[PDB]
Structure formats: C-alpha cells, structure tokens
Amino acid sequence: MQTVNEMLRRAATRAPDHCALAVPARGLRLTHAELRARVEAVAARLHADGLRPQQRVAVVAPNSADVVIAILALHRLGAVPALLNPRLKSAELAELIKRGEMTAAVIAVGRQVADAIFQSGSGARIIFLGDLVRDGEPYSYGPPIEDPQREPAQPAFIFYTSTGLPKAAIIPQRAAESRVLFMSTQVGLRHGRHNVVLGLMPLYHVVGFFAVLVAALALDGTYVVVEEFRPVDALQLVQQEQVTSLFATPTHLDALAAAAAHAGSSLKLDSLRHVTFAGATMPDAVLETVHQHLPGEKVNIYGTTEAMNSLYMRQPKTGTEMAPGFFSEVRIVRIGGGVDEIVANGEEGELIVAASDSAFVGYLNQPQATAEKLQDGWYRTSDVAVWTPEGTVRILGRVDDMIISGGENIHPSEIERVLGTAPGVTEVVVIGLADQRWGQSVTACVVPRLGETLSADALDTFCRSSELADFKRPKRYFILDQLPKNALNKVLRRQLVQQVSS
Amino acid sequence: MQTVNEMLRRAATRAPDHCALAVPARGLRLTHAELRARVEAVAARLHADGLRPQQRVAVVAPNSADVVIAILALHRLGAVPALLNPRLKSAELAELIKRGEMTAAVIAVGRQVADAIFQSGSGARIIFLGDLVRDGEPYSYGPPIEDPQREPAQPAFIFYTSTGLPKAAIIPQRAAESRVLFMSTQVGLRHGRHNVVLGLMPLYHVVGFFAVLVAALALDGTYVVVEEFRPVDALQLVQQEQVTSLFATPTHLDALAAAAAHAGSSLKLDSLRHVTFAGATMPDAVLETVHQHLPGEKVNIYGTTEAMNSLYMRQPKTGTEMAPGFFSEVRIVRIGGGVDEIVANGEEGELIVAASDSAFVGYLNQPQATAEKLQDGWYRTSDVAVWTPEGTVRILGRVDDMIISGGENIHPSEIERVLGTAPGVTEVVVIGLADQRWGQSVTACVVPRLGETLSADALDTFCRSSELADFKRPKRYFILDQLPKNALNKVLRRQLVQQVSS
Numbered sequence A, B: 001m002q003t004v005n006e007m008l009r010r011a012a013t014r015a016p017d018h019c020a021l022a023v024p025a026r027g028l029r030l031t032h033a034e035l036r037a038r039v040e041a042v043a044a045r046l047h048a049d050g051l052r053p054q055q056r057v058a059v060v061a062p063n064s065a066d067v068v069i070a071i072l073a074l075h076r077l078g079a080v081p082a083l084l085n086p087r088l089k090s091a092e093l094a095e096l097i098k099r100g101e102m103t104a105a106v107i108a109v110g111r112q113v114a115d116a117i118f119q120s121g122s123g124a125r126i127i128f129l130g131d132l133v134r135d136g137e138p139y140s141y142g143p144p145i146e147d148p149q150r151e152p153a154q155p156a157f158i159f160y161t162s163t164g165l166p167k168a169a170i171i172p173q174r175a176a177e178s179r180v181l182f183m184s185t186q187v188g189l190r191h192g193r194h195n196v197v198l199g200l201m202p203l204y205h206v207v208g209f210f211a212v213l214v215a216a217l218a219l220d221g222t223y224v225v226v227e228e229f230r231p232v233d234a235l236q237l238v239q240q241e242q243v244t245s246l247f248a249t250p251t252h253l254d255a256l257a258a259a260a261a262h263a264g265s266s267l268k269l270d271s272l273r274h275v276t277f278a279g280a281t282m283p284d285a286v287l288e289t290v291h292q293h294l295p296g297e298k299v300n301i302y303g304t305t306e307a308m309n310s311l312y313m314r315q316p317k318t319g320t321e322m323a324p325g326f327f328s329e330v331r332i333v334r335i336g337g338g339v340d341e342i343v344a345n346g347e348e349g350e351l352i353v354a355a356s357d358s359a360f361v362g363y364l365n366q367p368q369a370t371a372e373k374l375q376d377g378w379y380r381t382s383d384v385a386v387w388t389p390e391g392t393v394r395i396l397g398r399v400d401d402m403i404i405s406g407g408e409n410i411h412p413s414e415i416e417r418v419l420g421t422a423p424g425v426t427e428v429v430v431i432g433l434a435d436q437r438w439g440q441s442v443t444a445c446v447v448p449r450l451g452e453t454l455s456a457d458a459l460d461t462f463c464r465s466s467e468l469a470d471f472k473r474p475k476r477y478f479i480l481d482q483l484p485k486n487a488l489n490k491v492l493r494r495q496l497v498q499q500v501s502s
C-alpha cells in the first residue's frame, strides 16, 4: 500500500521545488519540500511533548495552511487525527472528544471549545493551533523522530458523519490510495505539475481531505487554500492561479455559476478542466446553469464517509442517475433484508456497496451502529435506489425519508424537486403525516418567496400539470413563514412534523 | 489490494453484458460475463485434472482469445502462469521450464516444444491449448472450485527478461493494481465503457498483459485481439472497432504512421485518443512521423519487467527525456556504488528505482542475480542516466554498452542515432575496440542502403558536421554487408566484436 504519508513523501522526492500549498490572499507559498520540512518539524515537536503513534487527536479548525500542516504532522508522527467540523456546538464537540477517548485536541482559537473540553471531564490535553505553527512557520524543538510502521487495517484517520450525534468512522491506512485515485479513474485527473486544485471543500469532509488536499499533492500539483468562500473571489483565484479542478457543493456551484454569468466580467476560466460535485440532491435547474456558465468536464459522484466513491456519471443530465466506477461493486437489496436478497430489476431497494480497500473499519466505540452498517463484507448506505432499463442506478432518497401511502413508496426528494419549480415557492419539505388507514399522507410544507402569496389550490394545480403520478401528489399543504433549522442550516424534519400537527 | 482476478471479477459485476474480448477477424465476441463463465469453466477443468494453487504453469503461445482465457483461468484457479515468448528456440523454452520447476506447460500446437520438454527430463505435464478451449468454447468438466486466498507478497505471475538465458521475474499479487493504474495516472486512461484497447503488445510482455489486456477489462472496456500484426489491418480495426488507445513498439508505430500517411486512404482514426510507447531507443525522425501521421495524445514511457513504470513524458520531443510519475521514486547513483551514493547533478550514474508495490520479489531460482538487482529497497535498472538542468531524467544507454575512451563515457546509442541519419546508412552499431592506452576506441559498424556505397571519409565528414562532441566521433568504421543477429532480430554485440577483430 501507499499511505497518505507515503504518497506525499514520494511526491516530495519527485517535485521538491514545485509549489505545494498556496494561500494567495496571505502571500504564502510553500514548495513540496518546504511543506515536508514544516510537517517534519511539527511532528517532532508534538512527539517531544509526549504524543505517540496510534493515539487519537481531535482537530477542530476551519481550512487554513496551518491546519493542513498540523494534520499531516499528526499523521507523520503516527497519531490518528479525528477531524471535526468547527461549526458544531462547543458542548457537542466536547462530547465527541470525550466519547472518542482522545489523547489531545488541536483547536483554532475562540476557545469556548477548550473550556467545553475541560468541563466535560475528557482529559484530552488541549493544543492550540497557533502554538504549533503560524502562517507555515513551525515552533521547532525536539530530536528527529522515526517514521513509524503503519499497517493496512490500522486506524489512520477518523471522520464524522451526520438520529443522534455524529459517528466516528475509522478510516484504515489502506483506504487512502483508492480514496485519492478514484479522482483519476472516475474524474479523469492525472499525474502532473499542471494540477492546481482549488480547496473549496472542508478538510474535515472526506472529499475535502482525500479527494482534494491529498490528491492535489499526491499528483505533484498545488493545493490552493480557501479560508472563506466568496464566489467572485473564488473565480478570480481560478484565473490567477490557473486552477485545473474544483470540487464544490451544489450550493457553492450555483453561486459560482451566477458569478460567471456576467458578460461585463473579465474573468478567464480557461484553465479549469474538471468541475466535480456530489449532485444527488441537485435540481435539474441548478445542473443546467452549471453546464451553461462553468467550463470543464462536469462529473457527478455518489459517495459516503464510510466507503468513499460508489457511483458516478460523466456529463450528467440529472443528479440522481449514476453508475459504479473503478474499485466499486454495488447491489440493490430488499429493504431490511440480507445482503444476498437482490431485488428484481425495476423494483426498489436499499443500495449496498462492497466494503473493499476504501471502506471504514467501523464506528469508534459504537459496535451496535457498526453491526447495522457493515454486514457480511457490504456497507449499507441507507439509501433507496432502483436499476433503470438502461442499466444505471437511480438514487431515490433516504430509507428514513420514505413515505408509505396506500402501501406505496413515495420519495419526498422527488416531490420537493417538482414543487421547488412552482411559482412563488422559495422552500419546500415534503413529509408524511399519519392518515386514518394506518399509513401516511403525502404533505408538503412550503415557504413563499418574499411578498408572494401561496395557495394550496395553485400548488395542487401545478402538481397536476407536472409528470408526477397521481399517488405522489401531496394531499395537503402547510404554508409556513420559515422552516425549523439547526445551526448547520439543515431542516429538522422531526421538529417539522410536531410543529404542523398543532 | 485488488488482484488481477478481483479487478476482472468486479468489472464483470459492473458491465456483465458489455463486450470484453473481440476477435473481429474470427467473428468472435464475448461479454465480460461470457468471458468470466469461460474462465471459470477452464479453471474447474484444470483443477479436476490435478492442478493446484501456487503451482507454476508455463504458457507458450502467441496472442489469441484462447490464451487470454487459459491465463486468466490458471490465475482464477490460483496457479502461477509463467508466460513465455513462443518465438524462442524450443530447447531454450524447455530449459526455462525445467529451470523453473513447473508443474505443467500450456502450449500452442507445433509441438516440437512438447518433444523438447519431454526430452529435457522436466516432468512438466504437457497441456495443449486446443484441449482446453477452442475459439472461446471450453471443454467443461469437474465440480465448481473455490476462489483461493491470495496474499499480497505471494507469487502471482512470472515474466521473462532478456548475458545468458532470460530470467524468471516473480510478480507478486499486490503488484497488479499499480501495474494497471499507471495507465490512468501517467497515460490518462479512465474508467468506462468507451475503452476499446487494441492488443498489439505480446501477452508475455508485462505491458501486453498488465497495461493492455488487464487495464482494458479492469476499466470495463473491450480488448481487441490481434493474432498477427499488419499495419493496414491494424488501422482498419481502429476505425471499425472505435479503438481509443494503443500501445505499440517504436517499430510497429513507424509502420502504422506510414500506413496512415496516404491522402488517398479512407481510414478514420478519430476514435484514437492515446498512442503510448516505450520510446527510449526511438530516433527523433520516427517520433516526428508519429506526431505527424497518428492522432491522439503521444506518451513516452520508461519501464522494466521488474518494476513496471518508472518514468514518462507527455507529448515527447525526444525519446530519452522523461520524469517519474505517480507510484515512482527514482535516484541516479555512482555506477557500481551503494543505493545512497547520489551523484552531483549533471554527473552520470545508474538509474535506480524504489521497489514498492509494483516491483518483482526476485528471480525464480536465481538468488545471485536477485541480490545484484534488488538492493536495500531499490531496483537497479543497469541503465545510465543524468539529471538535466530542467530537472528531468535523460536516459543515456545501458551500463554494459558504455565505451570508456580516454577515461570518458561514450554511449553508442547516441552515436547510432546520429549515424542512422547519414546518407546511405541503413544500419549502424557503435562498439568499443581495445586501443593501445588500456582503454577503448569508438568504432562504428555500418550497413549500406541497397546499392549505395559507404566510405569512412564521408561518414566522418557527416559526424564532423553534427552536434557530436569531438571525443565521441568514431575513430574507425567497419562497412559490412549485414550485422550478426539472433532469431529475435536482435544484434549480437559480442559476436560483432569478435567478427571485426579478424
């Protein structure tokens, strides 16, 4: 195998004087060799402070060159970085660190987080990011340290998912290589000093780390740091840095397209060859503006924290239709059945994917959730899917979102995509409410565009004119001024049911 | 890891009804699933006959769909195929089989080879290819057999090299994946049913097997069988089969270019996107006609049986200047020195390459040769090279071909490339002959174009007009009617020294 460390180490022998890490706004640029020396220096300092191989270390920080250096240093020493979203509540961050039995936590200042960890009882030693490295410059002490022995199944990195608190997925050493190289076999990246990769995806997301940061460096290219997303600024970096690939959220992509659409603009996006996204939830309209206003090859991917890439589609026409690429083996099985209970073609079931080299080895300290998701060599996505007559996979939605009305499956995502194109609608969530037949009734919760007036009659008229089969059209509308959302701007579906029942 | 078997097995789950193997001339076409069933059937028959996992089996046959099925079947059963060039002398083939302690040999009729094996004393059981499978159709008997456990360092395939008899390089299970995927990271192939790969390279060559056959199937594409090379016919297959990539010898490429150069021709080569070659020995002129007359991206690669791909160059300008790609780590060391004796930049030494996942594990039954080539984690290529001011690798020639004159290194390959452009010259070999100073004198052996008259004076005049430094120009010419060559049309350099000394 080639671990993350080995891939970076080899890259550095091949292109030592080539730019590895750029933070243009900060005027900060490091070659592959300069980056490696800084990683080595931070590793040695961390070791001298008592940190040892296979100890878990939390990382709580937003994207920056300094966190890149810290993460890779932990890995170089042989510690296991547990990368956490810093936008989570402080008490939740502290509970996950406690839960995970971490040795230490590396955190970015604004330390109501450090307070939280202390007062949780965790005993994770706090390490401030600014104490380790500042704008690429490390605080250096301690003897040089051995590059430790890493084993294929051994914990390497921990990444956190979405009922309840996020789960700590353990990524083994052997998973890194295919988690990078799918970007070559599926997305068509290739080795070379031409690679300039824009860092839009968060580092605590598996795509942000493996598919973006590691792939950039491992292919002997440049990773461009973005500390704060702004569409005009991001497109200017494409031109100025000669960016060749970008991976972004559907939401960032809609904003980037709109910014690229001005005829009075001087922006040159010619260098950009690959625009990649996880577009299962992307509406036809968003995808259309992406095709129109951004250059490069568009590639849709399906993936998970647990198993990385499982499906993709070159030059997609809709976001939900994809097929397995290199590394992947997929099935669709009876919802709630064993891994060998293949559905007849055209029937709906749960998408499952083989757990090969790229797969997590379990959820840290959560044996119960692990047994439910990893069964008999297969990862269970908890997504509903169907094989089409063309032999591709159509993603239908989450098992848990599914609505059963008159004994028939209805997927709110489909109905939401339709209703989101209706006049006056700015937001829509489709949910099932209990009927009097022991089933559920398709119900739509809609927010009006500012100043517009919605009506159940007009919305139903729009649905009747759509392609929606009769049984799918909402039986009832709730017109609301806003939807209940958590701090991560995500809709609280349970809270919504309870709200509309009274 | 993903073995050859696993890569093919996964491909077959992904594209069972897509064409895997085509022999257009024969009207023979098999899907991935049809191919897999035939592999399984041949494996089961071979097992029932007594063949077991980890036993070595020689394969002596020219490219054909049937040998593809036999090789993969042996691998499926878990036996170790030892692939042999059928153009070698029968007695030499029998000696290698004996030397290798093979359990059996699968051979293509014209069995002066079977006679040879018997009368060698080998005790390898003879298996005729035509007894196993005929035009894709297997002779089926025996119970279904288990897919055996394969381990990363365990022998998988054996491939033979070039003093003395060819050596049996043992390729481990873990080597297969990077031996395929370099075609993605270096050459820019990607996963997909668009892949149609023309099978010009021999299956008993590592490129022919890993980079061509296995890569074709593993990426869910089609392998087009070519039993006998003919330029017009090969280009017609490009058009008719919509070939996307081809890997050929410099010699085949010169012939394909010439055939493509006709303005009266109806050939459409539009589908062809990748023309790949090992061009270290390719003259500037040949490369020029390749650029002019063949479409697709041209990529030069450097590789070995022992370590697969170590250097490459996109859109090459000369054949000798390349750089390490993904997977690779390279050094240039003091000729005859330890692996850490790095040369100062611009000084000549031996190219060595790290022995990572793709590397052989040794030469079967040849511990002495193994110790010379695999030292301290490094494979020794026995090629001389130098780092250029641009930081690329320039291949200079074989260590053993090097001529020392007045204490200075001269590489005949360089002098041969120059002299091959001289009027009247059809063939040239540059050799060193003993001088009276305990060194060697640069001597050129030249064959005239049919009917042309060569002279030492005219040849020396041409050299004086070239870019050759003074010390490199031949001191002496031998004008010969032909050069001594073995049955593989290769020049016998030792035999040439002895011939011209009398």
Ligand SMILES: O=C(O)c1ccc(Cl)cc1
Pocket (backbone or CB within 6 Å): A206, A207, A211, A278, A301, A302, A303, A304, A305, A308, A309, A310
């Ligand atoms: O979580 C995701 O959406 C995700 C994870 C991994 C990949 Cl490759 C793609 C998407």
Ligand SMILES: O=C(O)c1ccc(Cl)cc1
Pocket (backbone or CB within 6 Å): B206, B207, B211, B278, B301, B302, B303, B304, B305, B308, B309, B310
């Ligand atoms: O033997 C060769 O020339 C050779 C072997 C392997 C590769 Cl990848 C390229 C060339």
Ligand SMILES: [Ca+2]
Pocket (backbone or CB within 6 Å): A481, A482
């Ligand atoms: Ca309100």
Ligand SMILES: [Ca+2]
Pocket (backbone or CB within 6 Å): B481, B482
């Ligand atoms: Ca003669």
